[PDB]
């Protein structure tokens, strides 16, 4: 599987929501994740198994999608929640991550 | 919860190295770590896992002889034995947790509580 | 015969994992009510069957049976096929009599659950050491 | 090892508790039998679990656990506490020999916590087939 | 029938390696006391069984037996598989009589150990040469 996601960069105001479209080459049975790479640190989970939100994530984050095209649909961009949002897939064999996405204001 | 590692020397090409991380909070016999490499510009790729007991060690198909993991259950640490370093696959390392697994396959997988990072550079 | 998507909470080696199951129909051949895990492949999915029975003039007792079948597949074997490798069966069989009250039946069920949580039994099962 | 084992928080309402002292392995077949101390030679609720090793014929471990608890009956002018209705319950697993520990425990836990879910609870308490 | 985690010191091709073993229960079917190596897989672990016996009216002798089973399993190339490959059995069987004293019994055991350390026997075993 070649996991791709379409926005290379992005800009929104801190009021407006935004979605990150991801797309899988072959069908995956709702088994992806979302990580949140900050500027000078290490990643962390946001969205488990494409819909299940953890307790460690803020409630603003929300993801949906079934079968082929998966996305997270963050409803309020709170200021200084920025970084690099990698995607990852756990089906098939070698798990392979995404390329990257920017979220500057 | 700390997952600090230290193996970060500047290593000549063709050589070998050894690095390990400690763990606190998590009972180490209960889980199985895995290393994840971040290519030093942007991207990421999975290195290798181990299971809860330390017997089954899972590799990727691309590199086979270069990597072996040993798991040391007594000292809450695992060792990454790297050998025959190629040029240009020098990048930072991280250790995962296997926190939130499901599915039939073992390597259907989830990664919380990432490490701090040590560079390996040739 | 009510059914619903059943979530299983805090089942794992640590107790942090969760499981989701969806119902897949009562088989009217032998009373087998099945629940399964939401997968595409019909042979790589954890499944749980349950079947309450009835007394004939042959055996003259209730016979509740629960089967669990977990199969863990293995990946590429020189080709990308995700084929199956190992089974892990599990069986539970209650043999409740006719004049039993519900107190002693629930006592048996709670006793079996608490004994499955005992340290002795996870010594026997999870590490296979005979006790 | 063996130990006095005590069930905690178990019953219809969960307020009951139970406790056992192992009666010792029976050498002939390897059955390991716990028992709950009750004075009578035969009214005691007893629980027996014995795990095998793969024999030449089948090659896979076969942990098996019975639980068999009977019940009392009333005075008939002679105080004997006779037994009437049994309530056997058995549990058996059969993981294959290559299975790792994580797989093995998972099935054990699942079985245990599945029973707490209402679906099992209605079926078992109430005999209404799911 | 006491048991404990037994460490084996200076056993290897060089003599620098160590081994750790943990006990895994007496089987009451046939007196087999087993020790094993601390592994998760029940089929990829070095194991050592020992079983002192008793005399019936059939054989009328003590019969001490020690088995060692080292199974080396090779790498599974495809991704993730693992499978046992070859076995390496080992058997030791003493046939001590009834009226034996402990001096000659310990003499036999010490003799067997020192003969296992001889250069002739590691010529015969480690290199598979016939006797010379």
What is the number of structural domains in chain A?
A: 1
Taking residue C91's Cβ as centre, other Cβ atoms within 10 Å add up to 16
Non-local CB neighbours of E22 within 8 Å, separated by 6+ positions? E5, E35, E36, E37, E38
d(CA C52, CA C64): 5
d(CA A71, CA A73): 6
Domain-by-domain residue ranges, chain E? 1-131
Closest CA to B83 of B4, B19, B33, B38: B19
For tokens 């390996």, the residue is B120
Which chain B residue's Cα is nearest to C41? B104
CA triple C58-C64-C68, angle to 5 deg: 130
Burial of D130 (0-12, 13-18, 19+ CB in 10 A): buried
- In chain D, helix, strand, coil percent, each to 5? 20, 25, 55
Which ranges constitute the DSSP H helices of A21-66? none
Buried/exposed B13-34: b ≥16 CB within 10 Å, e otherwise: eeeeeebbbebeebebeebbbb
- Under DSSP, is residue D33 helix (H, G, I), strand (E, B) or coil? strand
Burial of E102 (0-12, 13-18, 19+ CB in 10 A): exposed
CB contact under 8 A, D100 and E28: no
- E22 near E35, Cβ under 8 Å? yes
For E118, phi then psi, to 5°, come to -70, 155
Name the strands in the sheet holding E89-94, side by side, starting at the edge strand that comes first in the sequence: E6-9, E18-27, E32-36, E47-51, E64-69, E89-94
Domain B1-117 = CATH 2.60.40.10: yes
**First vs last C-alpha separation in chain C:** 40
- Alpha carbon A66 to its chain centroid, in Å, reads 14
- What's the CATH code, domain D1-130? 3.30.380.10
d(CA B104, CA C88): 12
- The technique by which this structure was obtained is cryo-EM
Q: What is the DSSP letter of E74?
A: P
Chains in contact with A via at least 3 Cβ–Cβ pairs below 8 Å: B, C
- B46 near A96, Cβ under 8 Å? yes
Regarding chains D and C, contact by 3 or more CB pairs under 8 A is answered as: yes
CB contact under 8 A, B111 and A94: no
Dig out the tokens for A53 from the structure. 């939100």
Chain D residues close to C122, C-beta within 8 Å:
105, 108
Measure the CA dihedral D18/D22/D23/D29, to 10°.
Answer: 120
For tokens 């695992």, the residue is B78
d(CA B78, CA B58): 14
Q: Which domain holds residue A21?
A: 1-105
Chain B residues close to D101, C-beta within 8 Å:
51-53
Resolution limit, Å: 3.6
Dig out the tokens for A54 from the structure. 């953890």
Domain C1-131 = CATH 1.10.645.10: no
Complete DSSP assignment for chain B = ----B----B--TT--EEEEE---SS-GGG---EEEEE-SSS-EEEEEEE-SSS--EE--SS-SSSEEEEEETTTTEEEEEE-SPPTT---EEEE----S--SSSTT-----S----B--B-
- A65 near A50, Cβ under 8 Å? yes
Q: For position A46, which CATH number holds?
A: 2.60.40.10
Non-local CB neighbours of E100 within 8 Å, separated by 6+ positions? none
Chains in contact with D via at least 3 Cβ–Cβ pairs below 8 Å: B, C, E
Q: Where are the beta strands (DSSP E) in chain E?
A: 6-9, 18-27, 32-36, 47-51, 64-69, 89-94
CA triple A25-A27-A31, angle to 5 deg: 110
Q: After which residues is chain C broken (C to N over 2.5 A)?
A: none
d(CA A21, CA A65): 10
Taking residue B111's Cβ as centre, other Cβ atoms within 10 Å add up to 24
Q: What is the DSSP letter of E76?
A: P
Closest CA to A19 of A83, A98, A85: A85
Rg of chain D on CA atoms, in Å: 18
């Amino acid at each position: 599987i070649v996991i791709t996601q379409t926005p290379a960069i992005l800009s929104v105001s801190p009021g407006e929501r935004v979605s990150f479209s991801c797309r899988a080459s072959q069908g995956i049975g709702t088994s992806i994740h979302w990580y949140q790479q900050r500027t000078n640190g290490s990643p962390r989970l946001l969205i488990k198994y494409a819909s299940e939100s953890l307790s460690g994530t803020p409630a603003r984050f929300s993801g949906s999608g079934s079968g082929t095209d998966f996305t997270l649909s963050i409803n309020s961009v709170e200021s200084e929640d920025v970084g690099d949002y990698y995607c990852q897939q756990s089906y098939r064999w070698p798990p392979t991550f995404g390329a990257g996405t920017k979220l500057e204001l | 919860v700390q997952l600090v590692e230290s193996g970060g020397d500047l290593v000549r090409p063709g050589g070998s190295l050894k690095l390990s991380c400690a763990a606190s909070g998590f009972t180490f016999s209960n889980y199985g770590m895995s290393w994840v490499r971040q290519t030093p510009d942007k991207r990421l790729e999975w290195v290798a896992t181990i299971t809860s007991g330390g017997s089954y060690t899972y590799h990727p198909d691309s590199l086979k002889g270069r990597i072996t993991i040993s798991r040391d259950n007594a000292k809450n640490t695992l060792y990454l034995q790297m050998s025959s370093l190629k040029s240009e696959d020098t990048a930072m390392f991280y250790c995962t947790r296997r926190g939130y697994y499901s599915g039939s396959t073992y390597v259907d997988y989830a990664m919380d509580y990432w490490g701090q990072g040590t560079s390996v550079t040739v | 015969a009510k059914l619903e998507t059943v979530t299983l909470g805090n089942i794992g080696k640590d107790g942090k994992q969760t499981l989701v199951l969806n119902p897949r129909g009562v088989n009217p051949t032998n009373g087998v009510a099945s629940l399964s895990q939401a997968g595409a492949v019909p042979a790589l999915e954890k499944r749980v069957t349950v079947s309450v029975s009835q007394p004939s003039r042959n055996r003259k007792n209730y016979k509740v049976q629960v089967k669990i079948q977990n199969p863990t597949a293995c990946t590429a074997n020189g080709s990308c096929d995700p084929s199956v490798t190992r089974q892990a069966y599990a069986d539970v069989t209650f043999s409740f009599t006719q004049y039993s009250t519900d107190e002693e039946r629930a006592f048996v069920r709670t006793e079996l659950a608490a004994l499955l949580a005992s340290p002795l039994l996870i010594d026997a099962i999870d590490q296979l050491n005979p006790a």
